[PDB]
Amino acid sequence: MSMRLIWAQSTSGIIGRDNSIPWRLPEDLARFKEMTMGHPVVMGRLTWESLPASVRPLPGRRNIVVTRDADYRAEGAEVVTDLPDEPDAWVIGGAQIYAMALARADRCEVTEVDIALTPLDGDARAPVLDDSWVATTGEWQTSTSGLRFRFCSYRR
Ligand SMILES: CCc1nc(N)nc(N)c1OCCCOc1cccc(CCC(=O)O)c1
Known part of the structure; x- marks a missing residue:
């Protein structure tokens, strides 16, 4: 029914490699904590x-x-x-967990990090959201770390 998905991705859609995250973005940690x-x-x-x-x-x-x-x-x-x-739960990890939960989801909360990453074999990629999702795109932002990022929210 009402699963929510939350993830952080590079602009190419990579959410990590072997769960390791190449960016340091404390503002994303803050928003993750607030949502979950x-x-x-x-x-x-x-x-x-x-x-x-x-x-x-x-x-x-x-x-x-x-x-x-x-x-x-x-x-x-x-x-x-x-x-x-679990009706009120947030799915927070597993490229495969996102794939399995996406069908039951009516909300996605995404952090997009402007960081170039070399594709490597077995990368975890973010779900591609189809045209059933209503997108709310936050303004581009700069982190205390110097990285450019933005928050986007998707609902249906
Ligand atoms: C935060 C990265 C993230 N960012 C987004 N936007 N979505 C995710 N699924 C996502 O990974 C969640 C798994 C890693 O979790 C951590 C890891 C370190 C510190 C904290 C904050 C602690 C607290 O929250 O108390 C949480």
Whole structure:
């Protein structure tokens, strides 16, 4: 019904390589925290293990880890084998988790980072949103880090 997707991507659409993020953008962390606090957050195992240890699990949010390995220990998170039907939840990671949740989604919150990245094999790419989405495009912004970025919101 009402899954929300949130991701940060380069302008070429890359959301990371092996979960590693090439940009430092504290304004994106701030907006991620504002959007997801007090709600379940749904993620893959690689996103979970890539969280900074001090916020694994992400505090103030019910953390849910989706993986085909039924036996997996995530201290502080709920381990499920399939995407859960949590109405108010935010999907936060897994290029494949975004793909699976997109059908159930009526909101996407995107940070676009103006950073050139060389494509590498097995890159995680952002979902391409079709014409059913209504886009609200924020103004281009400059970070305390010097990077240009913008926030875009999509609804249907
Ligand atoms: C924030 C990157 C991001 N940015 C966007 N826009 N979407 C995402 N899915 C997304 O990855 C979420 C997985 C990594 O999470 C972190 C990682 C480090 C610090 C924090 C803030 C802690 C807090 O929030 O308390 C969160």
